[model samples]
Target: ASPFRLASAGEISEVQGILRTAGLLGPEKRIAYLGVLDPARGAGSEAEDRRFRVFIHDVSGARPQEVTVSVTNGTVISAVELDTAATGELPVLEEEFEVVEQLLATDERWLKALAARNLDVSKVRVAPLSAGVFEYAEERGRRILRGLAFVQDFPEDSAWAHPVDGLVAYVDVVSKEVTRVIDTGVFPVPAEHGNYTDPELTGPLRTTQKPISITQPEGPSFTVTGGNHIEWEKWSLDVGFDVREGVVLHNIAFRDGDRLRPIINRASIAEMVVPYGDPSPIRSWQNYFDTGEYLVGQYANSLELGCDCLGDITYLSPVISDAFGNPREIRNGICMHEEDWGILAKHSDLWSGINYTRRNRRMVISFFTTIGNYDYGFYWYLYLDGTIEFEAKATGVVFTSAFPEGGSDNISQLAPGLGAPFHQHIFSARLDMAIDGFTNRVEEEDVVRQTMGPGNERGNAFSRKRTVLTRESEAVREADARTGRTWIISNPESKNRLNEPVGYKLHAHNQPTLLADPGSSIARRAAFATKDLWVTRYADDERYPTGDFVNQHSGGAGLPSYIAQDRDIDGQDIVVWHTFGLTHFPRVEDWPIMPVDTVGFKLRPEGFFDRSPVLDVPAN
Candidate 1:
């Protein structure tokens, strides 16, 4: 799965060539910012629409000294000057990265024999501290910067070493020294060798003649435009990206004939938490939240056409600025396609001599991000039935513990000399719902027994009391079987033909809040997952659930700080943050490459439409 996708040095030359031909490149002129330009994204119909973004920084003080050139297929399409200024963020200098890599590669106690004999630390890839990890340590009176380890990039034809084999180091950049080194003891992560390769030594599958394929005689039902805007049967949204959120979806709405109603202003995977059960010092700190520390979207895997998605698919690449502020394209960064979901709505009225069955076709916008040992695939489904599904699937080698981190302690036997301790993989989708309009109201209803005076002395029935949460404090809630607990987001003024407020019901599946202690590092760092749902007034800056920085952070920002203001959420723009969790306890079945365990939530329509929106859906 580890394949080279980023633009190489020669690829950069092509970018420069395009600029030079356009009279944008010279000694006095240089390309300071270069990013891989994704081709036309949504409804990719034209082949020539592929392009890239090149920012030219002209130091000769010429007219339009700073300009952006749009290049396509080694040709300049447009060279528009801009009033752009350099980003003020300090670069994590190559010197600092070398300092950490050197310390790890040279220290005999830390560096394995394989790397100790290597010449320069360049063979190992180094990453700067993620988010506020550096600041997080200073607050604790420790001046430390942490960096994760990865192997040197290699060609695809040869066998590549596992990049990240559970290794991390804490460094004091000011002193140019290593403070602590942690080798999670997880051995070389298995990597794929060839097509249909299986490195897992668990068992063998008897070869059989079962071939499965998905055929779409008629191609995708939607059209992607400008590599951003998407318009399907009734789904429309703009897809964009940045360092924080991998997939930035904007103005997601549903079309009802002539009217386009908004469902969400924006949404993205806010943060992810993988907490291990081991309590040893090294293993205990194994709790990780990928988005907080590293931009997973930046590590997007350019999926193979037929392998990633069957049938017809349109792949979109992303142009991202690297450490040196050069534009590096993430190949195959995004995908959009039409999927078959079996039956959408079916019914039969024998008495009325009527029969109706409509097929379910959804426009799926998807992308994949790899966070070390695990790969998470984010899938967004827009259904004809006026339902939106946000699903996440996790599959990869388990970050096995070293005999449950008991070289001296009670010695856990979780691994049969091959396995390890338990851990939990949790995810949360931060949704900025703009149902109908932004002035939305959230209500919590409870199923409680009727009082004797309310109905009868028998009091054997149950009742649902809907309460509008007027403030943030009372809006926090969880799923409950007894209460039939669920939350609703709606625009107070919007109503369907039935006069019922148009809204969407949030239903949770396979969801459980954090089992770690509230004050524990895992819980404090990932405050958003402590509850089933968190409703907060919309704040653009509050993008991540684990604050803006997650690397080595000991609970600084995020939900705890955001909720401190007690922002009113009754009738104003609100962001509904819901978590999807799975308390995974590894089994032998998960030994080799674990099967994809999916956990997700559904946003089904309540009274958004007057009647069955897909009732008119034609049968295939």
Candidate 2:
């Protein structure tokens, strides 16, 4: 038996040959996506399967439908006809970029608009949209295959150039025609030049290098066996990737003395939505579900060794399929490393004249995914102090709106002339908890202010309010800084020496909720952003928050529908869904290229162990 590997370039060719021989390949039919399907690994019901799932866009006949081709070994097993290609089913391929350019270049309206702004048609870069366009489609009944894009000037190689002085154009992918054009007469300020990160600058910006060098005095303290598999002290997990979810940590296990306990089944960012605050018709409807429309894994950028990650870093590669059904291995899609993190332990006893201080060492695995204007850097830290820090450091260009003057006192300038809009970047994730074991329960612990009458005459008292939710209906929760709410997932059957349930608590360190009206389409499609945390009984089908399919879907499908049954969740296999965001109100310093705005949640163990588990580490 051959070892399970992502379909190599050779294997994709084999599949293509098989398709040709099987008479499935023709002029009107095109392979949209093809990747090796994972064989079932776990025990019980979900077991035994390995094959290739190929997406075939069959434009040969009158009915435009997507056909899924399943292949096992070297033979084509089934050719199932699916519905018309939605944005979720397929992603905009590298080749499709040319198609968009071709449609725009020939359109007199698009050309006329570009000429008016001194924006060269050849120099302008087009950012295709992934928002639900069928909602805005005039040809409603018909399956509208349209692509909306934001095109702006990016002449030559100007690092300070921002594509805000832009135009929005819609194209019919099937018909290959431009439908509409909306131009916001904003032009790039002529003087905008030089990179923001560069130390030397001639304008209001002047930055210099502030260097901080780090090294391991006794060499590196961690080790990695397999290329992508990491093991550092008490933590171990396989770094993997999916088309939609991007970076995924699987088979996560933590050590407690001689025994290793599984904490999480799997975890990753489910999707992302950036909602704009501009009331303009062109920008008002801009609610982008990046993962739903375009897979993050497809755009994973390679990281530089010494630049991106510091100190003994190892790069990892994951294989994924392009729109042409060809599989390619992306290099440096993720980086893994070990670093020192402050004081792990400090103790001093004058009686014995003994003093000891040891710095904390942690293993960090990280990856960066850029969607449109924002770049999100996700990190998983395994600390020697029995703590794991999951951080998302956001950095990149902010989606800027155009002002008539291209600058404003209240509003920041993206370039010399472009105006920046206040936008919110909402991110959500799914965490399957296998705390101690597969069965667990969630408890919402809220810190409430005690009434001033008797409990506190000065009104300086607060108490914890514990709510044990046994069903999905009560699992939906919001984070109130005043109330100090925390959701804990624990094994009811398991307990520590303190007689407390062995568990892990979920807390949003820094998050912003959705500000759109609940009835609004932006609010409906991304309802998960309305709350901080939600719990549901584990089901294989309920992986995504906006349901499985999000492209062109106005609303209804993901988390909202999954918990509709409101089944009993007490002491059952459960999953926790967390949503957090960065409400970006642009500032002058954010212009040119914006630095990351990191925001995410935290999962800390609560009574999962008797005492300090890392105390046994040698104080070297």
Q: Which lDDT tens digits does candidate 1 get at residues 112-220?
A: 6335434235455544443233223333423345665544444422112233435667776545567766665554432432212443532567688676777667766
> What C-alpha lDDT do the candidate models reach, one value each?
0.65, 0.69
Model 2 lDDT at residue 412: 55
RMSD of 2: 3.9
Instruction: Give the local distance difference test score of model 1.
Output: 0.65
Evaluate model 2: give its TM-score: 0.87
Clashes of 2: 6
After superposition, the stretches of candidate 2 with alpha carbons farther than 4 Å from their true spots are 1-48, 51-54, 58-79, 84-89, 133-155, 159-167, 183-220, 349-354, 405-411, 451-462
- The candidate that wins on TM-score is 2
Error (Å) of candidate 1 at residue 402 is 2.1
